[PDB]
Design a protein around this ligand. Structure first.
Ligand SMILES: [Zn+2]
Length: 178
């Protein structure tokens, strides 16, 4: 179901942190995962998810059906193009509350297009369930380029406005969470 990496043009298009930019009708989810008991990690998995159900649900389906074992722990990290929608966000926090051997860190390139108060709550329900929510910065984009993109060993070229858009996004995110 999931992919290993994505085409460089899909990365630069869906992961540009232009807070308000339509054309991104899909939601992409880069993930990395560490499976571990009570010592060091005994395995790991990374990959990419696209919308085809949202990309969030395509993860939880694949994850539960193929990976989740009751006597093992999971350190999951998400890099999403759009921040998770209210419906998926609630279904993740419900998963998080029932599965304590899973910890999630969500980094998003963007929040939402409109100021939906609905969406700010799902982002809060997530945080209340122990999940870590943050806005992707230069280092996160750089990390996704090197790990989830067929980059052909080309450097990550940051776009104009990266830091400025992240700054406006991290501001709005912090107000949501507190
Ligand atoms: Zn969603």
């Amino acid at each position: 179901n999931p992919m290993e990496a994505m085409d460089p043009h899909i990365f630069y298009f869906h992961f540009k942190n232009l807070r308000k930019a339509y054309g991104r009708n899909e939601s992409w989810l880069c993930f990395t995962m560490e499976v571990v008991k009570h010592h060091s990690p005994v395995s790991w998995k990374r990959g990419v998810f696209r919308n085809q159900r949202h990309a969030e649900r395509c993860f939880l389906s694949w994850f539960a059906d193929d990976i989740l074992s009751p006597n093992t722990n999971y350190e999951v990290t998400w890099y999403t193009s759009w921040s998770p929608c209210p419906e998926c966000a609630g279904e993740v926090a419900e998963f998080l509350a029932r599965h304590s051997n899973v910890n999630l860190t969500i980094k998003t390139a963007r929040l939402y297009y409109f100021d939906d108060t609905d969406a700010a709550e799902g982002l809060r329900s997530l945080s209340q369930e122990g999940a870590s929510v943050e806005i992707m910065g230069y280092k996160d984009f750089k990390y996704c380029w090197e790990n989830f993109v067929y980059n052909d060993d080309e450097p990550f070229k940051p776009w104009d406005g990266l830091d400025y858009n992240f700054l406006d996004l991290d501001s709005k995110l912090q107000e949501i969470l507190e």
